[PDB]
Amino acid sequence: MTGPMCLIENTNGRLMANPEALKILSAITQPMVVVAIVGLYRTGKSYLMNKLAGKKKGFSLGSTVQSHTKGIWMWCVPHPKKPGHILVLLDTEGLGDVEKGDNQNDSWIFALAVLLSSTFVYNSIGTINQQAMDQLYYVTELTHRIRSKSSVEDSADFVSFFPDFVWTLRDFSLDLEADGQPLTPDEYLTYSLKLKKGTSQKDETFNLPRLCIRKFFPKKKCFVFDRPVHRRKLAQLEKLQDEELDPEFVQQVADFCSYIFSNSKTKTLSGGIQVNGPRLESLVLTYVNAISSGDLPCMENAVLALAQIENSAAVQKAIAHYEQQMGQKVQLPTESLQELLDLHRDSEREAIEVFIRSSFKDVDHLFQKELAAQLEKKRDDFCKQNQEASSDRCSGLLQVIFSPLEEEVKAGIYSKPGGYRLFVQKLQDLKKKYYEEPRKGIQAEEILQTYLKSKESMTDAILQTDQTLTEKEKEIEVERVKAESAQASAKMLHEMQRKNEQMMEQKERSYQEHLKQLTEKMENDRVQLLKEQERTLALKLQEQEQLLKEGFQKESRIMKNEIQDLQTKM
Ligand SMILES: Nc1nc2c(ncn2[C@@H]2O[C@H](COP(=O)(O)OP(=O)(O)NP(=O)(O)O)[C@@H](O)[C@H]2O)c(=O)[nH]1
Numbered sequence: 001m002t003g004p005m006c007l008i009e010n011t012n013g014r015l016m017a018n019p020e021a022l023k024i025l026s027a028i029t030q031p032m033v034v035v036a037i038v039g040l041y042r043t044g045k046s047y048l049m050n051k052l053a054g055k056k057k058g059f060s061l062g063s064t065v066q067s068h069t070k071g072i073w074m075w076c077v078p079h080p081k082k083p084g085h086i087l088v089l090l091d092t093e094g095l096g097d098v099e100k101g102d103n104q105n106d107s108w109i110f111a112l113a114v115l116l117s118s119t120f121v122y123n124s125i126g127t128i129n130q131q132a133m134d135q136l137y138y139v140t141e142l143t144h145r146i147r148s149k150s151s152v153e154d155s156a157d158f159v160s161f162f163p164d165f166v167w168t169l170r171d172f173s174l175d176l177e178a179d180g181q182p183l184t185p186d187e188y189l190t191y192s193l194k195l196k197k198g199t200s201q202k203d204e205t206f207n208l209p210r211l212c213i214r215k216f217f218p219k220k221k222c223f224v225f226d227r228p229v230h231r232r233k234l235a236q237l238e239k240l241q242d243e244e245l246d247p248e249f250v251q252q253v254a255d256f257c258s259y260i261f262s263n264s265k266t267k268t269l270s271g272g273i274q275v276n277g278p279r280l281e282s283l284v285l286t287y288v289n290a291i292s293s294g295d296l297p298c299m300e301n302a303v304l305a306l307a308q309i310e311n312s313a314a315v316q317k318a319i320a321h322y323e324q325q326m327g328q329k330v331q332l333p334t335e336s337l338q339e340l341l342d343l344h345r346d347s348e349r350e351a352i353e354v355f356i357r358s359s360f361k362d363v364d365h366l367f368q369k370e371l372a373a374q375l376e377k378k379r380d381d382f383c384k385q386n387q388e389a390s391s392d393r394c395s396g397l398l399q400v401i402f403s404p405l406e407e408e409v410k411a412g413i414y415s416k417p418g419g420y421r422l423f424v425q426k427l428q429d430l431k432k433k434y435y436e437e438p439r440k441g442i443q444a445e446e447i448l449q450t451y452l453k454s455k456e457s458m459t460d461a462i463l464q465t466d467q468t469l470t471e472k473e474k475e476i477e478v479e480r481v482k483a484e485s486a487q488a489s490a491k492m493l494h495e496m497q498r499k500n501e502q503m504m505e506q507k508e509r510s511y512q513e514h515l516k517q518l519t520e521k522m523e524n525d526r527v528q529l530l531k532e533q534e535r536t537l538a539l540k541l542q543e544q545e546q547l548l549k550e551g552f553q554k555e556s557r558i559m560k561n562e563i564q565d566l567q568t569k570m
């Protein structure tokens with residue numbers, strides 16, 4: 001991207017995804033660290049975001065008195081500290097002072113920034129006083145804009161998926177002086193979010209936004225920035241060189257950028273899923289569609305929506321893998337059914353592995369069941385092709401090997417004295433030849449036996465004709481031939497029975513292979529979820545302790561409540 005592009009348009013009160021932007025996202029396959037900035041209009045948000053892009057000329061800037069950015073803009077640039085990663089910068093339409101009304105989608109822009117980011121930067125001018133905290137109603141209001149799941153307490157889940165929070169304070173006017181040594185900006189943020197005792201409406205209003213920031217975001221950070229230049233040059237800031245700006249401001253910006261580059265994490269969804277272009281595109285579509293539908297954007301629903309897409313593709317990818325492996329290894333007709341089934345089993349195992357590693361949230365295992373159904377059909381097709389190839393080969397061999405004999409018999413070559421011995425010897429030699437032919441396939445015994453049985457009268461015809469054989473000797477031969485026919489029948493019957501057994505055995509083995517890989521994936525998913533829950537537990541215990549140490553039992557006890565509820569889910 002040579003420059004930023006609008007990702008979400010905001011026109012006539014409607015938010016809509018920019019198709020051109022979605023197209024760009026579909027092409028970025030690398031993991032993304034998403035940093036979004038929000039705050040009152042004209043507070044230097046776009047200017048600061050251009051610093052992260054590390055380039056002049058990026059997001060367009062406005063004046064110090066008029067709003068500029070509209071909707072949500074994105075700029076995907078290579079991450080300067082993480083090779084193989086993309087840094088996605090989201091610049092947003094400046095918030096208005098609610099105590100003025102209008103600006104309908106302010107809250108939604110704010111909520112989308114929270115849902116789409118890895119790091120959420122709240123930018124304001126001044127200090128953290130009552131005036132500043134009143135504007136944070138936008139954070140308090142998140143409980144009315146975002147839903148964690150669809151299956152006063154839903155917000156208890158926010159800390160598990162919300163971005164890290166960074167408060168950037170512009171034109172900072174405090175020296176932060178304190179007994180001994182000055183407060184650091186992070187200590188100043190802690191000081192600023194401390195609660196006030198009391199149950200009055202005023203007390204509740206003071207504590208609410210502070211509690212929301214402390215409880216909804218997993219990590220908080222603060223950076224202060226001095227006035228960049230003299231008031232008469234603020235409007236030319238973009239064209240000024242670092243040497244023309246306050247040295248401390250230049251260093252503060254450098255420290256902010258360094259922190260972002262070193263601490264902002266790859267955007268992740270439940271299950272450790274790392275968000276890349278196609279995945280972010282899905283989230284944008286789902287959340288914006290929800291808002292456009294008059295519904296609340298829901299994290300759970302978005303993950304599931306993403307699952308639907310990737311799981312469908314996973315089934316197709318697995319089937320493709322199966323077809324490829326079978327095609328590269330099969331030689332028809334196969335020497336035996338075991339040969340074909342062994343190849344099928346191996347290809348199927350690899351295909352299921354492809355599906356398992358490419359899928360997630362396959363509720364009710366519906367997608368894996370679909371895969372199983374498709375592989376079974378594929379297996380049936382190969383089996384049919386194999387039997388057909390065998391039938392063709394064996395019937396062909398029958399023509400090549402036995403036809404000459406049949407014709408000799410019809411020509412009377414064996415109807416002379418001593419012809420029976422010559423005939424039986426020739427027939428045995430020909431049956432041996434048939435059996436020694438390579439890769440006849442699974443129909444070898446059935447094709448031969450059916451033929452030999454249909455021509456049974458031939459043997460008797462030659463026998464009774466030969467005069468060089470006594471009647472007793474002929475009686476012996478008739479019984480010998482009857483015994484050989486019965487043995488040929490047994491070979492055909494066993495061939496039939498064994499094939500059925502092998503098919504049944506393969507059916508059971510395939511079922512067990514699916515179960516094995518599924519059980520293993522479910523186990524891995526359980527471990528990953530518990531790990532995520534343990535992190536949330538750690539974050540909530542931490543806050544509970546801070547609240548108690550701060551002297552607030554009423555709020556600290558409320559935390560213990562959320563902790564108990566989390567533990568019922570573990
Ligand atoms: N006082 C002050 N002005 C700044 C600072 N950083 C940038 N500016 C100036 O403020 C004006 C607006 O900057 P811009 O980044 O467009 O602000 P914004 O927050 O993005 N406005 P909007 O939300 O409406 O899009 C420009 O003249 C810019 O030079 C700062 O730290 N302090």
Ligand SMILES: [Mg+2]
Nearest residue numbers: 045046068069
């Ligand atoms: Mg702007």
